Design a binder for this molecule. Sequence first.
Ligand code: 88Z
Ligand code: CL
Length: 265
Amino acid sequence: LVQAVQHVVIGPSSLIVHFNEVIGRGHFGCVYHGTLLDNDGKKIHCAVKSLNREVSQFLTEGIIMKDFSHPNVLSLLGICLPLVVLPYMKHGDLRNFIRNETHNPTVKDLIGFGLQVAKGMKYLASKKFVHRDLAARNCMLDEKFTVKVADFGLAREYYSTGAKLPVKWMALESLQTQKFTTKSDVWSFGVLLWELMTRGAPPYPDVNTFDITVYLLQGRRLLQPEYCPDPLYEVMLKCWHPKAEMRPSFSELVSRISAIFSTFI
Ligand SMILES: COc1cc2c(Oc3ccc(NC(=O)C4(C(=O)Nc5ccc(F)cc5)CC4)cc3F)ccnc2cc1OCCCN1CCOCC1
Ligand SMILES: [Cl-]
């Protein structure tokens, strides 16, 4: 842990945290605007993730990130003895971007964001990593409109054994056994595409949190969104297959969505 922290350790001298500017705050964590300095003295706008007051939990979260080098996965700039330094994402979380009525992305752009999460998840599934909390709320969007798959971790109504669970994003086997696999990230990815094609509408509004397991066993799935092309809805239904082995891999997801995306001007 600390041998790895020391590899990505940032000097307090190199980082200025703007405590006067909070991008957001939860009970466990807080996110500030920040300026990171390189050896040439150039300034890097960043986000400083801090604990309000479980210290090793925070540092493990940031240490897992050090292994992730992909354009569709959020990177760690470093740890400062503690504060976790992340690259600043000009557009915030994906759900909030798509939910803005004045933003007008085309059906192709929304599919394009869906292909980006799929590419990132492919890379993660390759590294044997299981996300556990895939949702549009945990996908970041940078200046060049590049989706970065992330997790607000400690800094994170959509969540209900101490388990704080995102039940509406969860696979049948995960809701019934609290065990997660890459195949269960595929289910959540299906819910993520539904979210994108509805432009941040809440999944299963009419449905309660706890009751979601019996809703699904009745043979119910999210309806086809209005912007959603038919082949893309077929993809979503493959993600929500009750048996895990029948769900498309993320590699097949990149494939099928690349072919749907490529049919638009
Ligand atoms: C809420 O708004 C923002 C939040 C940001 C942010 O938050 C975090 C995201 C993820 C982590 N993750 C983590 O700390 C970890 C993680 O992500 N691990 C992880 C896990 C799996 C994976 F695949 C990749 C990474 C837990 C360690 C930590 C963060 F602090 C990081 C960087 N830039 C941000 C910009 C934001 O708005 C910009 C301003 C937008 N304005 C425009 C409109 O007006 C008002 C809003
Ligand atoms: Cl159809």
